[PDB]
């Protein structure tokens, strides 16, 4: 039971990296060029896009993916130099658990569970409130939900292993 | 008879991956930039494109291709770690069969067998119903039919092997 | 005489792959962005481009190139697994001959021997018949003729080897 | 205590290179195409963009990254040719410390800690003072702060090792 | 004297390939997007560009480069299979000489020694004669002259070796 | 003293190649698309850009970089074939010195030490003299100065070694 | 009682002529230039304006005003030539009554009592139904109501005189 | 019976002049500015408008009105100079009859009984046949019918008087 | 004292008519062509202009001027026909007083004392509230104040004469 | 026979004045606003219109009409002052004859008998020869022919009277 | 001396009325349509035109002309009714003098002696200060100076007559 | 001889007034709307039109026509009041002579004898010198020459009468 868990954790991690790396870079490519607002004021599109999308999803996901792989690299570099290992194993597991729980909570607090098609903006130089329109909201919602689903499994597995000890 | 079946399954899988990877990424590249509707309302093109094409074909095909290769990776990782194999062989065959039948059914239910050149849209902010025009419908229909044809062979072969036992 | 034939067949095949792969992808890149019709009707350009160019040359050539290399892969996979070979050799030669004759005939029936600079279109939403103008017709004609020339040699060589037995 | 310091220095350096190389090249790609000023004078956008952004962040960061890796290459080339090493070790550590402190100070003096959304320009051919609007200011501020944070750790670690001797 | 000739021939060939491959692909990239004619007739730009530039320089140079490397590949494939060599050596030298002289003559007859900045066009649908304007004529002239210079050396060297026997 | 000189020459050469190859290709990418003149005459932008920038900096630098590496390749090919070496060593050093001094002088005579923001043009079809505006002049000036600085070191080092004999 | 009736009839007639002649010609002047529809189809504005406004109000009112003054001119011309009068007086009164009742009924049946601000159009070449927007609807409604009010008095007065005999 | 005929002829003539002079000049004012064709060819609108409307209705009607009043002026000038009258009376009646019958026939042969909303044009520089759209067709049809009705009465009356003698 | 009052009343009336008739028709001529709103929605300008200016000032003033001259015309027509006068004099004075007081009150209730330069609009098809800008507000305010001043004198004079009896 | 000639001369003169004054001023009103040339050069339309139409028809006709009425005014002023008359009568007849023959000849030499729809222009700043398109050519041809016809009668009549003496 | 003064006063008054009435109405006709500012903000042109030209010159001059003719009308109406005259003569002279001095002073205080070609504007919605450009400044300056010159003579003459008593 | 001179002077004066009043007002109507310069600078057209045409021809001619009729009005007003005449006759003749000579000289000094089609402008905000293009230069030259011719006759006649005394 504990034998297969490692294999499936490795497979889930590789699957997530592959899915993010191969297709996700090209849904968001036209994010700002097809964002449009009903207005004649110069500079309103920039401010309203910036307020609607402060950090793009793909940047957050790349950062999370890179940051969740550091303890393994540290352990590998230590063992390579060696040529209390168990204490290092315990500590890196603890750190990975903490980092992944923090990242999941931050994702939930930053983005929620949906991307709406309309956005209402009231930032200078826009006069009062204006209405703007988003590109590809359904695909982005699907990607959001898929990533949340993938991220839950890793949390579950790491808690499993934490509790087996 | 059962000897050649494995060889042809491997060849079909590699053929499908190559066809999707090399040429398919560039028919759909201009999907939204050349989508146009007869209207003067800002934001209507975004809503009507989103309603006509919720998930693009190439994303669905990439996802399917990646998801149908996971049991092999699991078996390989297990055997590498080993350094009841037959039970694992049986189970992974069952899982692959199920996944490929599910994906074929989902393709049929999502897209059908044709891409029409006209689309009729009645989503806000569009006033009543408007007419929009699609890019490269014939090429996309050809690609659809080809992919359905390729996908049928794999189902047939996997049922063959399932029934030989 | 039969010794050099294999060497020249291999050289012709590699030459064709290289020519198609390195330069051909960039003559057709602007095929639709510089296609223009004399009209004020929205959606006429899409319909007329689709009727004038149902499948682009480069897609057909990539498909043909990929499909004419499958018997070799099958023979290689069989021999690798082995670790009646002559019957397989005979059959794969027959199949390659048939496939290449079919593809040459299909090319002739699909495209002919020239690409004209003007096209006359009468498809909805275009009113009656309209005149449209093509990009780079001379270069595309040169490419067509070159590909036909290259494809003839392979047919000749394969018939040669078929008849030597 | 001094054992782990080398491992963490190597990990921080690799992390910085990866973060800069993979995602940073694509936030700044549209820096000038979406920069716009409220004016009708030809040539004002060029002058005001040039005055607001004399050297782009990504160029400065690439230059710094490349320049902070030269002492290691020199030491490696020397040792490879060998086939007073300790004096070379001391000197290269001193040089790396100096270079990294200089680069951090220069970053602080060139850019500060924020990127504002508005810029006021009074350069010819602009008449008097004009107002211009920046793209993606929040993301660029986040990147600035992250890079400052990363750069502080290296300074601390190098001072640590300098003082251990 | 005959010893160094082979070394310099190899160096010239590699130099030509590198120069063509690394920089030449990006001077001609905007060839048609910045070609403009003084006219209001739709379709005149396409016809006049096609008449002014029937085959682009870079296509001709790529084709020539690929075609001048075939005899070496043939000799290599023969010798690999072997595991009258001198007759093959003689014949391939003769063929290479002929091909390179033909290609130099064709270059001279196709393009000449300069690219002018203005072009006068009288092709349908253009009314009578119109004036059009070319992009980057000086850089293209420099490239033309450089390529002619490079190509002369190879002819000289091959005639040298032909005459030494 | 002569031991370290070779190491530093190699490091400077590699540094120059890396700096030119990684970042320099993307400052000049938009050189002509953001070049604009105050005029209504068709074709004036092409002529004035061509007169202001006959050969772009990056082309000159790539050519120089490629041409300054040929003597090493010649020496390597000779020594590989060998399987009066000192005379070849002397001669290639002389040739490298000459080539690098020529290239530095040519750079100084072609470009000078600055790129101004305004340019005054009087070429047909422009009527009398017109004013045009350049993109990113400060960054291009910085690059110019940096390249001159890098190029001076190599001249100094090669004269050093020439005079040690 | 019958003495003042003639005086007030004359005053009402003159008042109506003056009101129509002096101000009414300039509310409707921009009727079609400021009529606009939400569409991109050429020719839709013409068809929809024609269907919304078949005959403009001012034309109908001018025609009515001219036609209601003919019996007086006939009586005057007869009496001038004279240089059974009572029978002519009776008959012309009858005819005037009939004409004015007919014109009031026709006005009611042609225009109603209001001019709406929106109009829904489904005439070729408009695709399906489109929405169009009218200029100055409130002023036109006020004019309509005023004219109906003025026209009622004349009917009442003429019936009065008819019944006094 | 013959007494009233003169009075009614005079009233009809004055009515026609007033109707044409006061309102008719302003329906046709925008005849060419709101005429539009579905095309991108310069000069097609001019040719198609000229072919659809060779002589405008209002010019024909003004000419007819002026030409039908000449015999009265001649008779008046003769009688004024006098300070065989019956022969002149007979002859001028004959001439007026002939002129009015000719003008009615010409109207019928020039314009018919309706103005359609669409017109199909095939005149140079228009390519093949194009579709154009007319302004205010219903109002112009109403005016046509009204003028025909008015013109019939005069013919009838003049034949009446001709036959009474 | 009562002698001059009639003279000054006549002079004030003529002055008002002249001022309104000669210059007032040309300040308001461009009222709608230079009215503009900050929006991209078709039809918003029409609705917002109609809501901001339901009846234009000049129409109201023309109507008032015409309506305040009817009692004099009635008295004149009566006296002309005569060829209880004092009762008619009394009654017409009463009626004129009432009409002028009503018109002054209505002016105050319709327009107030100023025309602002900005207007805030929230009528369909405008999304939420939009800002629009008026033409020539200061001149229109001056005209408003002048007309109120002129209208007060007539009220005062008529009350004077009413009270003298 | 000589009695009626004066009456008909007076009628023809008045007819010509009326025809020119009432309708001719409004065919030529849009002469330059709807004149268009196929070109992108600023200033070409002005030069080509000026070369095609140096003096407009209506100016020439107004000038001729005014100049042919001066002898009558002179005779009238003389006779009014009187309060050798026959010598003045003779001389003014001679002068009128001469002036009208001169004007007819000048008309023929200036304009000819037709107005073509196309005009070919080669005046600076137009590059080489360009094609331009005229407005309302058929109506202008009809007017030309009518005016020539009218002008012939006056010449005939004046020669008649000249020869009767 | 006092005899001619009245004649010249009458001639000057009539001259001023004629000059203002015949030509002055058509220099200012395009005052706002050719007023333009260097800005992209909607509504800035309206505010800046209103601030630069609060009341147009021609309105002020028409008002002054009308107001300076009232005392004569009053005297005429009094004398007509008569069918202490000297006291009325004295008083009306006094009033005319006062009115004309007031109007001249007001002209000087409102407009000055010149109309500049540039205007600097800082009114909302304009951002900071913007530059705008006036139409026909020299002609307007000439008109200003001429009107001041004309107005001085009347003041002088009226003071003359005032002092003769 | 002196008898006819007065008659011809009166006829010439009336002819000049008629020619200026009837046709001249409509050649210059589009003077600024069709004036265009080759430039992209806002405000350059206004400055260059103002510098090319400070006072329009028609204004100068109207002013001259009005000013040359004042002595007659003065003499008429004097003689009307009378109900030393010869001294007044002498003086007014002298004044008319002086005024007409002054006006002819001023015309020559202001305008010359031709209107060119091109104008070269160097006024702010135009950068350096720009080229502009005039409307209808030939017609304006014809008008200039005609007016000079007409004006010469009056000078000659007035000198004639001056010298007869």
Contact at CB, E59 and C15, closer than 8 angstroms = no
Look-up: residue for tokens 């008629």?
Answer: L18
How far is it, in rounded angstroms, from Cα H54 to Cα J137? 9
Question: Is there a cis peptide before residue K5, judged by omega within 30 degrees of 0?
Answer: no
- End-to-end CA gap in chain J: 14
Using a CB–CB cut-off of 8 Å, the residues of G that contact B are 38-41, 127-131
Q: Is L128's CB within 8 Å of F128's CB?
A: yes
The parent domain of residue B141 ranges over 2-163
Kindly state the DSSP code that residue A83 receives in the 8-state scheme.
-
Between CA I49 and CA I60, with CA I55 as vertex, the angle to 5 degrees is 150
Counting as contact any 3 or more CB pairs under 8 A, the partners of E are C, F, H, J
The Cβ of residue G18 has, within 10 Å, a number of other Cβ atoms equal to 13
Mutation target for K interface from D36, D37, D39: give the one with most K CBs within 10 A.
D39
All chains having 3 or more CB pairs closer than 8 angstroms to chain I:
A, B, G, K
I69 Cβ contact partners less than 8 Å away, ≥ 6 residues apart: none
Query: Resolution of the deposited coordinates, in angstroms?
Result: 3.2
**Straight-line distance from the first to the last Cα atom of chain E, in angstroms, rounded to the nearest whole number:** 14
Whether H25 is in a domain gets the answer no
CA separation for the pair A26, A135 (Å, rounded) = 13
Which H or E element spans position H83? none
Here the CATH number for the domain that contains residue D38 is 1.20.1440.80
DSSP label at residue B27: T
Å between D29 CA and nearest CA of chain L: 29
Cβ contacts of E108-115, under 8 Å, gap ≥ 24:
E108/E148, E110/E55, E110/E60, E111/E57, E111/E144, E113/E141, E113/E144, E113/E145, E113/E148, E114/E141, E114/E144, E115/E140, E115/E141, E115/E144
Contact I42 B41 (CB under 8 A): yes
Residue among H69, H2, H13, H100 nearest G73 (CA):
H13
Helix, strand or coil, per DSSP, at residue L106 = helix
Specify whether the CB–CB gap between E60 and E107 falls below 8 A: yes
SS (H, E, C) chain E: CHHHHHHHHHHHHHHHHHHHHHCHHHCCCCCCCCCEECCCCCCHHHHHHHHHCCCCHHHHHHHHHHHCCHHHHHHHHHHHHHCCHHHHHHHHHHHHHHHHHHHHHHHHHHHCCCCCCEEEECCCCCCCCEEEECCCHHHHHHHHHHHHHHHHHHHHHHHHHHHCC
3-state helix, strand, coil in chain G (%, to 5): 65, 5, 25
For residue H131, give the nearest of H60, H48, H66, H38 by alpha carbon: H38
Q: Do B8 and C50 touch (CB under 8 A)?
A: no
Burial E20-37 (b: 16+ CB within 10 A, else e): beebbeebbeebbeebbb
User: Nearest-CA distance from F117 to chain L in Å?
Assistant: 16
In A, minimum Cα distance to D36 occurs at A43
Q: Is residue H24 part of a domain?
A: no
Task: Give the count of Cβ contacts less than 8 A between chain F and J.
Answer: 5
As a whole number of angstroms, the distance between CA C44 and CA C49 comes to 8
Stated length of chain F: 165
Indicate the SS3 state at residue F140. helix
Give the contacts of F69 (CB within 8 A, at least 6 positions apart).
Answer: none
What whole-number distance in Å separates Cα of residue E134 and Cα of residue E112? 17
Q: Which helix (H) or strand (E) holds F62?
A: helix F57-67
Of residues A124, A27, A47, the one with CA closest to residue D138:
A47
What tokens does K37 get?
A: 């500012």
For residue J130, what is the enclosing H or E element? strand J130-133
Number of neighbours of residue I128 by Cβ within 10 angstroms: 11
Q: What distance in Å separates residue I45's CA from the closest CA in chain B? A: 15
* Coil/strand/helix, residue C34: coil
DSSP D121: E
Q: Residue F127, Cβ neighbours under 10 Å: how many?
A: 17
β-bridge partners, E118: E133
- Of L5, L3, L22, the C-alpha closest to L158 is L5
Answer yes or no: do K131 and D129 touch at CB < 8 A: no
- Mutation for E interface: C31, C121, C135, most E CBs within 10 A: C135
In this structure, are residues D45 and D36 in contact, taking their beta carbons and an 8 Å threshold? yes
**Token couple for F41:** 């005459």
**Is the distance from CB of F21 to CB of F118 less than 8 angstroms?**
no
Q: Which ranges in chain B belong to alpha helices (H)?
A: 2-22, 44-52, 57-67, 70-82, 85-111, 137-163
| Chain I residues with CB-CB distance to A40 below 8 A | 38-40
Give the dihedral sign, CA I39/I42/I47/I53: positive
**Per-residue CA distances from I18 to D30, K67, K70, K72, K107 (Å):** 63, 11, 12, 16, 22
L contact test, residue of K11, K119, K140, K149 with most L CBs within 10 A? K11
- How far is G27 from G40, CA to CA, in rounded Å? 28
Report whether J133 contacts H47 (CB < 8 A): yes
Contact assessment for residue D110 and residue D60, using Cβ atoms and an 8 Å cutoff: yes
Across the interface, of G11, G22, G137, the residue whose CB is closest to I62 is G22
Max Cα separation, chain A? Answer: 67
Q: Do H78 and J7 touch (CB under 8 A)?
A: yes
Residues in chain A: 165
Compute the distance between CA of residue G148 and CA of residue B148 in angstroms, rounded to an integer.
71
Q: After which residues is chain H broken (C to N over 2.5 A)?
A: 83
Q: Which two tokens mark J14?
A: 């008045």
Nearest CA in chain F to J40: F42
Minimal Cα–Cα distance from D41 to chain K, Å? Answer: 7
Cβ <8 Å between D42 and F27: no
Report the alpha-carbon distance of residue J45 to residue J42 in Å, rounded: 8
Contacts of B42 in chain I (CB under 8 A): 40-41
Say whether G126 sits in a helix, a strand or coil. coil
Q: How far is it, in rounded angstroms, from Cα I142 to Cα I146? A: 6
Beta partners for residue E130, in sequence order: E121
Q: Pull the structure tokens for residue D116.
A: 């504002």
Contact E42 C7 (CB under 8 A): no
- Count of CB pairs separated by less than 8 Å, A with D: 57
* Total of domains in chain D: 1
How far apart CA C103 and CA C147 sit, in angstroms, is: 12
Report chain B residues touching chain I, CB-CB < 8 A: 40-42
Beta-strand ranges (E) seen in L2-133 are: 36-37, 118-121, 130-133
Q: What is the 3 state secondary structure string of I66-133?
A: HHCCHHHHHHHHHHHHHCCHHHHHHHHHHHHHHHHHHHHHHHHHHHCCCCCCEEEECCCCCCCCEEEE
Pick D136's closest partner by Cβ from A50, A66, A77.
A50
Find out whether E28 and E115 touch, Cβ atoms under 8 Å: no
Beta-ladder partners of I132: I37, I119
DSSP letter at F112?
A: T
Cβ-nearest to F7 among D54, D74, D125: D74
3-class DSSP string for E39-54: CCCCCHHHHHHHHHCC
Q: Where are the beta strands (DSSP E) in chain F?
A: 36-37, 118-121, 130-133
Q: Which chain C residues are within 8 Å of E55, Cβ to Cβ?
A: 138-139, 142
| Preceding omega of B131 cis (within 30 degrees of 0) | no
Are G47 and H133 in contact (CB < 8 Å)?
Answer: yes
The DSSP 8-state label assigned to residue L128 in this structure reads S
Query: What residues are paired with D88 via a beta bridge?
Result: none
Which chain B residues have a beta carbon less than 8 Å from that of I40? Answer: 42
- Distance in angstroms (rounded) separating the CA atoms of residues G80 and J47: 62
């Amino acid at each position: 039971s504990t034998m297969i868990g490692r294999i499936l954790l490795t497979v889930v991690v590789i699957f997530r990296i592959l899915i993010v790396a191969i297709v996700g870079e090209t849904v968001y490519d036209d994010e700002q060029t097809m964002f449009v607002c009903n207005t004649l004021q110069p500079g309103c599109n920039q401010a309203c896009y910036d307020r609607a999308f402060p950090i793009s999803h793909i940047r957050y996901w790349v950062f999370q993916i890179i940051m969740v792989c550091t303890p393994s690299l540290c352990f590998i570099t230590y063992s390579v130099h060696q040529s209390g290992i168990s204490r290092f194993y315990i500590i890196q597991v603890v750190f990975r658990n903490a980092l992944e729980i923090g990242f999941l909570v931050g994702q939930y607090f930053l983005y929620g569970f949906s991307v709406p098609g309309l956005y209402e903006c009231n930032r200078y130089p826009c006069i009062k409130e204006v209405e703007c329109y988003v590109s590809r909201p359904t695909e982005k919602t699907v990607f959001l939900v898929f990533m949340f689903a993938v991220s839950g499994i890793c949390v579950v597995l790491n808690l499993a292993e934490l509790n087996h000890l």
